[PDB]
Amino acid sequence: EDELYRQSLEIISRYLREQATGAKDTKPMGRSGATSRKALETLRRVGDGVQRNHETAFQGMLRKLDIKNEDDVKSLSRVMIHVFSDGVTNWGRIVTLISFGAFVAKHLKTINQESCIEPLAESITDVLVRTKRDWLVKQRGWDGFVEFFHV
Ligand SMILES: O=C1NS(=O)(=O)CCOCCCCCCN2C[C@@]3(CCc4cc(Cl)ccc43)COc3ccc1cc32
């Protein structure tokens, strides 16, 4: 159906939840599981680092957003399109999009709003896929993501 969106949601959703809970989801990945697994391995590697390399900027943006409830979470999509979409696309910016997402996911857990995590993963996936599909396809999607960061 829309395999790119589905795979993206599973990858982004799993990373955010893992980041928030600190525990790995042992369920099998859906279609294209080998790729999604590698993708998650990759996000654990480069995503974690981004959150630390931009510690100050990340906490600065989080404060600016002042996320306290569900309505604040809903407001995030507008900011994502404003900051992420409106700019030249590259894997780094995509990793930052997803990494700050994980940063926000951990925050949501600290303020006991864990139920907003999956909805947030959906919003991020919507922004990534629905505004950058052409770039993603041209760059070989997630297979391209894994190859890009291959060590
Ligand atoms: O390359 C970037 N900026 S840059 O050019 O200045 C590169 C350096 O920046 C350092 C951190 C700067 C602060 C982080 C701002 N964000 C987080 C966003 C906005 C709110 C939001 C909410 C949620 Cl749930 C997910 C994502 C996001 C959008 O994803 C991004 C993607 C790329 C950059 C910055 C962001």
Side-chain angles (χ1 to χ4, degrees), residues 2-151:
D2 183 341
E3 139 100 293
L4 177 59
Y5 184 85
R6 186 211 68 79
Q7 184 173 214
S8 299
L9 185 61
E10 186 161 39
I11 290 173
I12 292 173
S13 180
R14 291 214 182 195
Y15 183 53
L16 268 57
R17 301 183 308 88
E18 179 179 299
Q19 287 279 297
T21 76
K24 213 168 289 214
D25 185 0
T26 67
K27 274 174 236 309
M29 294 280 182
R31 200 187 307 219
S32 301
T35 292
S36 295
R37 281 195 282 297
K38 284 215 184 116
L40 189 52
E41 181 278 331
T42 299
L43 274 179
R44 292 184 184 123
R45 184 153 48 77
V46 189
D48 290 36
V50 179
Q51 296 180 61
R52 288 280 68 196
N53 290 327
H54 299 286
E55 163 182 75
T56 308
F58 266 44
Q59 318 222 76
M61 179 55 73
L62 181 56
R63 178 214 179 58
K64 237 187 263 178
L65 295 176
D66 187 19
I67 306 165
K68 306 171 295 297
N69 52 234
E70 173 180 57
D71 300 318
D72 295 321
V73 179
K74 299 201 300 169
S75 80
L76 299 178
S77 180
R78 170 173 195 175
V79 186
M80 287 189 282
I81 283 130
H82 189 288
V83 184
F84 167 71
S85 297
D86 191 21
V88 174
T89 313
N90 60 53
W91 286 124
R93 289 176 59 75
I94 291 180
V95 168
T96 296
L97 171 74
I98 293 171
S99 297
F100 186 78
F103 197 71
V104 170
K106 288 181 283 175
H107 169 78
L108 288 171
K109 188 223 180 201
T110 79
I111 67 173
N112 298 287
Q113 283 292 309
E114 291 200 60
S115 75
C116 297
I117 299 178
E118 295 204 301
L120 176 64
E122 186 170 71
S123 297
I124 300 183
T125 303
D126 284 340
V127 172
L128 177 60
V129 177
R130 310 205 185 268
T131 75
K132 301 297 176 177
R133 183 184 302 277
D134 286 79
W135 188 93
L136 290 172
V137 167
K138 190 171 184 189
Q139 292 310 319
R140 288 170 51 71
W142 294 96
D143 272 338
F145 174 72
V146 169
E147 304 177 319
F148 191 71
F149 295 107
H150 176 75
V151 287

